[PDB]
Amino acid sequence: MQIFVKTLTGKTITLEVEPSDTIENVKAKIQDKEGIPPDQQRLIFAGKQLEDGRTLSDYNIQKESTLHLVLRLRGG
């Protein structure tokens, strides 16, 4: 399925994913498209930050959902 990830600029990043994809895997896809390391990504859906070891399905993130991406510097 397809999901959308919006940055603070308003840029939408379109990703191909499955419900069983871990948050870490979604971040890896983000890194492939934008060059941003996973540890430096904060992914947010419906106001809740998404934990790396959890999955899209864990948060009930269904097809065509919009996630928000905030960046941190290396080391946090």
């Binding site: 941190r72 080391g75 946090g76």
Partner: protein, 151 residues
């Protein structure tokens, strides 16, 4: 040269603190240099830092209040958002600074940070993980460090 307005703002904030002194922090200059303050905060009640007394160092930039003050602990503290150099991962000291914020409000937010850690955005990943998976152990070690270093 830049710095005159910043000095005026610094004076205003000192005036604010004198008119409405907080109960659990103190802050101000410690010499001729008004751009360098010492701060002293109590760890919040209903936290493992309760009763601890922590020192901070504050350096105002010449373009204050456009840019935030630099604020760091000088007392060692065990906390997912504060590292061994005393740097503090707090939104309002970095990308979310507003010139409308004051030192008194910064000290309040640092208090809130101590009472409610943010393991979503750690400076110390090892500590954030302990906070998430074993709160009792986090609390014990935070208190041990408070006893050792904040007294």
């Amino acid at each position: 040269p830049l710095g005159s307005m910043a000095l005026k703002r610094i004076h205003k904030e000192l005036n604010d603190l004198a008119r409405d002194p907080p109960a659990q922090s103190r802050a101000g200059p410690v010499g001729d240099d008004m751009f360098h303050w010492q701060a002293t905060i109590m760890g919040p009640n209903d936290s493992p830092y309760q009763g601890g007394v922590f020192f901070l160092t504050i350096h105002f930039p010449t373009d204050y209040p456009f840019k935030p003050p630099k604020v760091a602990f000088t007392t060692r503290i065990y906390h997912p958002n504060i590292n061994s150099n005393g740097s503090i991962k707090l939104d309002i000291l970095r990308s979310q600074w507003s010139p409308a914020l004051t030192i008194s409000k910064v000290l309040l937010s640092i208090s809130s940070l101590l009472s409610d850690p943010n393991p979503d955005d750690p400076l110390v990943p090892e500590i954030a993980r302990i906070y998430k998976t074993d709160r009792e152990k986090y609390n014990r070690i935070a208190r041990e460090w408070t006893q050792k270093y904040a007294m």
